[PDB]
Amino acid sequence: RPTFYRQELNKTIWEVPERYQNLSPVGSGAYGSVCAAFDTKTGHRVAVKKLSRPFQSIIHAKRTYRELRLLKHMKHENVIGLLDVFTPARSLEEFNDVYLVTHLMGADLNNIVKCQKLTDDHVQFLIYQILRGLKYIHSADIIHRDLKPSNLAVNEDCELKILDFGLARHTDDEMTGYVATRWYRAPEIMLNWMHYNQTVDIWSVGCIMAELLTGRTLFPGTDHIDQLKLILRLVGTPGAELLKKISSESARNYIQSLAQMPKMNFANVFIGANPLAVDLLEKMLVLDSDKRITAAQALAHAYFAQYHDPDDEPVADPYDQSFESRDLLIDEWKSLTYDEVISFVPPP
Ligand SMILES: S=C(NCCc1ccccn1)N[C@@H]1C[C@H]2CC[C@@H]1C2
Ligand SMILES: [Cl-]
Numbered sequence: 001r002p003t004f005y006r007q008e009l010n011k012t013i014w015e016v017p018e019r020y021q022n023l024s025p026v027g028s029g030a031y032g033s034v035c036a037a038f039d040t041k042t043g044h045r046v047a048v049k050k051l052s053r054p055f056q057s058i059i060h061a062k063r064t065y066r067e068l069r070l071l072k073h074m075k076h077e078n079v080i081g082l083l084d085v086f087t088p089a090r091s092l093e094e095f096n097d098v099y100l101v102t103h104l105m106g107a108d109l110n111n112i113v114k115c116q117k118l119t120d121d122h123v124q125f126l127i128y129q130i131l132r133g134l135k136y137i138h139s140a141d142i143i144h145r146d147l148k149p150s151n152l153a154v155n156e157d158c159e160l161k162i163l164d165f166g167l168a169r170h171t172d173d174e175m176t177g178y179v180a181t182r183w184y185r186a187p188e189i190m191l192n193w194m195h196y197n198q199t200v201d202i203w204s205v206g207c208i209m210a211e212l213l214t215g216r217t218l219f220p221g222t223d224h225i226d227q228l229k230l231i232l233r234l235v236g237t238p239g240a241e242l243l244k245k246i247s248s249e250s251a252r253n254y255i256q257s258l259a260q261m262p263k264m265n266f267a268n269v270f271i272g273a274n275p276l277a278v279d280l281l282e283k284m285l286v287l288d289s290d291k292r293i294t295a296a297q298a299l300a301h302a303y304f305a306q307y308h309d310p311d312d313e314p315v316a317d318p319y320d321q322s323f324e325s326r327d328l329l330i331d332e333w334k335s336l337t338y339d340e341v342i343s344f345v346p347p348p
């Protein structure tokens with residue numbers, strides 16, 4: 001067991017191993033506080049995330065377990081990777097606090113795309129890395145669900161990592177009105193049309209790739225309905241085949257109230273873009289999710305000819321998510337989380 005020291009950082013007590021020095025607050029969502037630090041063991045500038053009220057309810061306790069299981073599994077260049085997890089507790093009986101550690105990232109896609117100049121070569125490399133990471137995530141039957149520019153970390157050399165997996169956190173109010181939180185969402189999940197699957201992430205990659213090419217948001221809707229009208233104007237109103245797959249009758253009833261529109265010409269929307277970029281956007285931005293290109297199929301598209309290497313696009317170990325259908329008490333979720341903290345093995 002390392003030695004721990006205590007310090008108060010913006011109204012909060014932090015108890016961390018001596019290896020972590022020069023702690024300084026970076027911010028706080030509603031589910032945690034984050035400090036920057038120097039790790040004397042690895043020599044990395046690290047990002048440390050402390051959880052707020054991890055075991056306050058059954059919902060919160062299960063979310064804490066879900067986040068720790070997911071972060072312990074992900075071992076890929078283009079996805080967030082765990083360096084450490086710790087608790088100052090010496091037993092299950094006094095266990096209350098969880099701390100998570102990752103290699104530090106100082107900016108998102110918004111920081112590097114708006115406030116710089118992107119060649120087609122930059123767009124190829126950034127979208128290649130997102131799809132390399134997604135092939136790995138999807139091979140473990142994991143769905144991200146919340147891909148958007150603020151959840152993609154990018155460094156000086158244009159190297160990219162996916163972070164902030166959807167842990168089923170987003171509220172009704174967070175998705176309301178003129179908000180970036182909704183602009184990258186597939187229409188089947190925005191309006192609860194049907195049981196969704198991993199194809200929802202490919203829709204989000206299409207919206208991100210269009211925005212890198214034009215410098216503008218693809219579907220900046222003022223509300224759920226305005227956004228659907230923007231989507232259907234580009235990709236066309238649904239045919240009988242997709243309408244049958246919408247399980248919600250009221251959702252089906254509303255779509256059928258809209259005047260029929262054909263799919264637009266993408267060469268006339270994305271004026272001047274590489275024709276191979278236009279062709280890939282047409283294969284991602286398909287209304288019927290059954291017919292979208294997969295991450296594994298997209299990596300072999302001629303747009304990425306420069307970067308594609310089928311011997312260096314790895315898949316994940318199997319990931320058991322049977323806990324998701326399990327009904328347990330707070331103290332049972334807390335015991336499972338404790339076991340995952342003490343069994344952690346750091347990377348080499
Ligand atoms: S290193 C980082 N997030 C990791 C958070 C985390 C998540 C899990 C465990 C530990 N730390 N985020 C950078 C700060 C903002 C600017 C670029 C991105 C967003
Ligand atoms: Cl230490």
Ligand SMILES: [Cl-]
Binds near residue numbers: 079081082102161
């Ligand atoms: Cl990482």
Ligand SMILES: [Cl-]
Binds near residue numbers: 087089
């Ligand atoms: Cl504790």
Ligand SMILES: [Cl-]
Binds near residue numbers: 148149150151180
């Ligand atoms: Cl964003």
Ligand SMILES: [Cl-]
Binds near residue numbers: 318319320321
């Ligand atoms: Cl597993």
